[PDB]
Design an enzyme around this catalytic site. Structure first.
Site, mmCIF file in Angstrom:
data_model
loop_
_atom_site.group_PDB
_atom_site.id
_atom_site.type_symbol
_atom_site.label_atom_id
_atom_site.label_comp_id
_atom_site.label_asym_id
_atom_site.label_seq_id
_atom_site.Cartn_x
_atom_site.Cartn_y
_atom_site.Cartn_z
ATOM 1 N N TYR A 32 29.804 -100.059 32.999
ATOM 2 C CA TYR A 32 29.748 -98.420 33.281
ATOM 3 C C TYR A 32 30.906 -97.931 34.038
ATOM 4 O O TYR A 32 31.518 -98.696 34.856
ATOM 5 C CB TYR A 32 28.250 -98.049 33.917
ATOM 6 C CG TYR A 32 28.154 -98.489 35.315
ATOM 7 C CD1 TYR A 32 27.748 -99.606 35.422
ATOM 8 C CD2 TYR A 32 28.511 -97.963 36.384
ATOM 9 C CE1 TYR A 32 27.222 -100.168 36.764
ATOM 10 C CE2 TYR A 32 28.298 -98.441 37.740
ATOM 11 C CZ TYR A 32 27.743 -99.404 38.094
ATOM 12 O OH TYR A 32 27.765 -99.789 39.255
ATOM 13 N N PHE B 92 33.429 -93.010 41.400
ATOM 14 C CA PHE B 92 32.777 -93.168 42.651
ATOM 15 C C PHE B 92 32.193 -94.738 42.460
ATOM 16 O O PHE B 92 31.795 -95.359 43.456
ATOM 17 C CB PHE B 92 31.520 -92.355 42.884
ATOM 18 C CG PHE B 92 30.520 -92.190 41.782
ATOM 19 C CD1 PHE B 92 29.496 -93.217 41.878
ATOM 20 C CD2 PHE B 92 30.555 -91.192 41.007
ATOM 21 C CE1 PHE B 92 28.481 -93.160 40.936
ATOM 22 C CE2 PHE B 92 29.638 -90.926 40.043
ATOM 23 C CZ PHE B 92 28.491 -91.990 39.827
ATOM 24 N N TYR C 223 20.650 -88.928 42.144
ATOM 25 C CA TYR C 223 20.356 -89.018 43.519
ATOM 26 C C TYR C 223 19.889 -87.998 44.394
ATOM 27 O O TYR C 223 19.942 -87.792 45.589
ATOM 28 C CB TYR C 223 21.832 -89.842 44.171
ATOM 29 C CG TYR C 223 22.096 -91.130 43.445
ATOM 30 C CD1 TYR C 223 21.339 -92.349 43.689
ATOM 31 C CD2 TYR C 223 22.825 -91.168 42.466
ATOM 32 C CE1 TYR C 223 21.752 -93.482 43.335
ATOM 33 C CE2 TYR C 223 23.293 -92.465 41.817
ATOM 34 C CZ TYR C 223 22.412 -93.614 42.340
ATOM 35 O OH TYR C 223 22.827 -94.747 41.621
ATOM 36 N N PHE D 283 28.672 -90.530 33.490
ATOM 37 C CA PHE D 283 28.709 -92.044 33.503
ATOM 38 C C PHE D 283 29.333 -92.066 31.879
ATOM 39 O O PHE D 283 28.985 -91.846 30.924
ATOM 40 C CB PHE D 283 27.462 -92.703 33.327
ATOM 41 C CG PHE D 283 27.000 -92.970 35.039
ATOM 42 C CD1 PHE D 283 27.338 -94.016 35.795
ATOM 43 C CD2 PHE D 283 26.169 -91.993 35.476
ATOM 44 C CE1 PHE D 283 26.818 -94.009 36.979
ATOM 45 C CE2 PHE D 283 25.521 -92.132 36.576
ATOM 46 C CZ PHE D 283 25.944 -93.141 37.372
#
Lengths: 111, 115
Positions: A27, A37, A83, A100
């Site tokens: 990923y 990130f 998140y 993603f």
């Protein structure tokens, strides 16, 4: 809803991840400004996990089983399925939408 | 997968007088690494310091605990393993698949006070 899957490269269109299955993916995660990130591809280390059991963010738990074996797709995940509002700063800012790139490499003993 | 909480290594001292207090806006250049040394995040590579309020939960628990322990201009390394929530053991990971994250931290500024 909280996560949309958009196909890029088709898999075998037969083997799909089910609850309890251990999944192997490569990923790359990006924020909405296009900045990276996290990436398993950069580390040359595929990530392995059980998928039907809430061991990862809901975006992955819902999105990944919609992919077939060998599929490449882009999971677009809201903060809710991600998140949350808290996030994980400075790694992941609060209220972040996640994009993603995901490649399903294996399902249990399949590959 | 042993570490718990926050461990602070002192790399280079600051001025030893100015420490961030609760509510202070702090300027920080940081690099995030895994236990094996792999870099996954860096403000240094973005050529722009990470700026945030400290001690108000706008950054992770490990940072709100570690950063106020540094003085202005200090270089330090924060080995952080979250106790609760995302990234902690038993929770979905922030960097799959890890729980212990290592942050190289340089305290560049405290409010308008610069190092």
């Amino acid at each position: 809803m909280g996560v949309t899957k958009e196909l890029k490269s088709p898999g075998n269109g037969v083997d799909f991840p089910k609850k309890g299955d251990f999944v192997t993916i490569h990923y790359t995660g990006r924020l909405t400004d296009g900045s990276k990130f996290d990436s398993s591809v950069d580390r040359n280390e595929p990530f392995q996990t059980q998928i039907g059991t809430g061991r990862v963010i809901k975006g992955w738990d819902e999105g990944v089983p919609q992919m077939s074996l060998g599929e490449k797709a882009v999971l677009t995940i809201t903060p809710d399925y991600g998140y949350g509002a808290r996030g994980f700063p400075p790694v992941i800012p609060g209220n972040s939408t996640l994009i993603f790139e995901v490649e399903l490499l294996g399902i249990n003993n399949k590959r």
